[PDB]
Paper text:
The 2-deoxy-D-ribose-5-phosphate aldolase (DERA) is an enzyme involved in nucleotide catabolism. The enzyme catalyzes the formation of C-C bonds between an aldehyde as an electrophile and acetaldehyde as a nucleophile in a highly stereoselective manner. The structures display a canonical TIM barrel fold built up of eight β-α repeats in a toroidal arrangement, with an additional N-terminal helix (α0) directly adjacent to the C-terminal helix α8 (vide infra). Furthermore, all DERAs investigated in this study form constitutive dimers.
The X-ray structures of both psychrophilic DERAs were determined with resolutions of 2.1 Å for [name] and 1.8 Å for S. halifaxensis. We note that the relative orientations of protomers as well as the characteristics of the dimer interface for both psychrophilic DERAs closely resemble the situation in the mesophilic (E. coli) enzyme. Comparing the substrate binding pockets of the new structures with DERAEC, no amino acid exchanges or significant conformational differences were found within a radius of 5 Å about the natural substrate (as represented by the covalent intermediate included in PDBID 1JCL12). DERAs from psychrophilic species had a similar thermostability and were around 20 K less stable than DERAEC. In contrast, helices 5 and, particularly, 6 and 7 show markedly reduced strengths of rigid contacts in the psychrophilic enzymes. The relative B-factor distribution of the backbone atoms reveals a tendency towards increased flexibility in helices 0, 6, and 7 of the psychrophilic DERAs, compared to DERAEC. Hence, our X-ray structures provide independent clues in favor of the hypothesis that adaption to low temperatures in psychrophilic DERAs involves a more flexible environment of the substrate binding pocket. While in DERASH and DERAEC the melting point of the oxidized form was still lower than the wt value, the exchange led to a marked increase of 8.4 K in thermostability in the case of DERACP. Further tests for the DERACP-A95Cox variant revealed a much longer half-life at 50 °C (>80 min vs. 1 min for the wt) and 86 ± 8% of the wt activity. Nevertheless, by installing a disulfide bridge in the interface of DERACP as a psychrophilic representative, the melting temperature could be increased.
Residue numbers in the entry:
A (entry chain B): 3 to 248
B (entry chain A): 2 to 248
Write the structure that this text describes.
């Protein structure tokens, strides 16, 4: 049932806007859009400086349960620990519920597994008692199964609450192949860790591919809002269309 | 005053500013480079909060640790939402700001709400405790009247402002001699430890002399060092260096 899929995917969305030129009105408008005719998305995902305005709008429309996710070390995934930590500290101070941190994947590709652990760990510590930490490993740039698995393992060891496939800002983002690798790592290490495919999920058919992977690898009941998110934007209109809201 | 001497004096009091909100890392590094000028270092740079970590790294790499990093919050609108201004100020501190330039809720003051201005400046001052100085932009170009400019200054100072600053640079009217005179007089009458920062429309040494002469005459010759006086400006630097004969 494609409508059941669409309804389920909508409730797991991190409704994303990351143009870096948003106006405050566009952020208010995004929060309004997250309060959809078929229900609320799980979250929004926006740049840190927009969090106070978003928190205010979400509260005014009586949907404070819609989480505010943001991004740090983004999009490049540089290997500078001081900068990533400063941004994550600021994201928390802005009022973020969740921080989507970009893993230093280029450093990993060059054989440095240590900076990735260190960066994820100190940023996790900075979120303590305030926010969840998602870690973006950028699977489209890691390419190989070995690297995708390895980044996933390091991120979980260092304390990630979610592992996320992509920034959305590179050539290749979420893929079924990458998703299967990451979901499998989650199963083998810690089923408490969530999974977030981002970029390339545009309709209910795409959503079903990733939901079916999660259901088949981790069980039918695993992928709730605490364990599964879609990083997406245009997906919401497509899902609403599928659900009969043109 | 001697115009070249003023140029030299004014340069060391600059908060070299870039607030386009479309800067890249490279433009921030370049701003830091410019602040290390052939005539001496500016007192600070002033940039949006998210650029502070890159600026910090760049300032360290060119070995200019004493150039402070200032930023802006509640900016530029000066809205009267305390929670938003507080959260931005906390983030600015978390990013690593040395100084936070907060916009006072001046439209609320114009409508007769004097309390929100006090409360907002105070909680933001508290958020800076141990980490940063708080400057308060009262937007004199919008307050317009001497009475409102004096009142916003008094409120900012009572609530704990380390500096009072004339303008955001984002409205039609910014620093003016008239506004400066009122603000410097309030400082003189309430607390000479509070600094003054004319900002916006200061484009050359002639402009700078106006504000330095006012400070000198009202508070004394020794008063306006970098702890008590800043110029909020950008293209001013190039103008001063040209006046000083530097390339």
């Amino acid at each position: 049932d494609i409508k059941a899929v669409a309804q389920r995917a909508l409730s797991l969305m991190d409704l994303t806007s990351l143009t870096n030129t948003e106006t405050d009105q566009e952020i208010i408008d995004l929060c309004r859009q997250a309060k959809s005719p078929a229900g609320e998305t799980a979250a929004i995902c926006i740049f840190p400086r927009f969090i106070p305005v978003a928190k205010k709008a979400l509260k005014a429309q009586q949907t404070p349960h819609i989480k505010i996710a943001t991004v740090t070390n983004f999009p490049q995934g540089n290997d500078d620990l001081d900068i990533a930590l400063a941004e994550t500290r600021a994201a928390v101070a802005y009022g973020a519920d969740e921080v989507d941190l970009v893993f230093p994947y280029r450093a990993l590709i060059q054989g440095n597994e240590t900076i990735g652990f260190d960066m994820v760990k100190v940023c996790k510590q900075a979120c303590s008692g305030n926010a969840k930490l998602k870690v973006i490993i950028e699977t489209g740039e890691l390419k190989s199964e070995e690297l995708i698995r390895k980044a996933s393992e390091i991120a979980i060891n260092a304390g990630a609450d979610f592992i996320k496939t992509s920034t959305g800002k590179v050539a290749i983002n979420a893929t079924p192949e990458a998703a299967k690798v990451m979901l499998t790592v989650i199963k083998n290490k810690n089923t408490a860790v969530g999974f977030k495919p981002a970029g390339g999920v545009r309709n209910a058919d795409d959503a079903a591919i990733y939901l079916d992977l999660a259901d088949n690898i981790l069980g039918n009941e695993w992928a709730d809002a605490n364990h599964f998110r879609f990083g997406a934007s245009s997906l919401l209109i497509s899902l609403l269309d599928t659900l009969g809201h043109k």
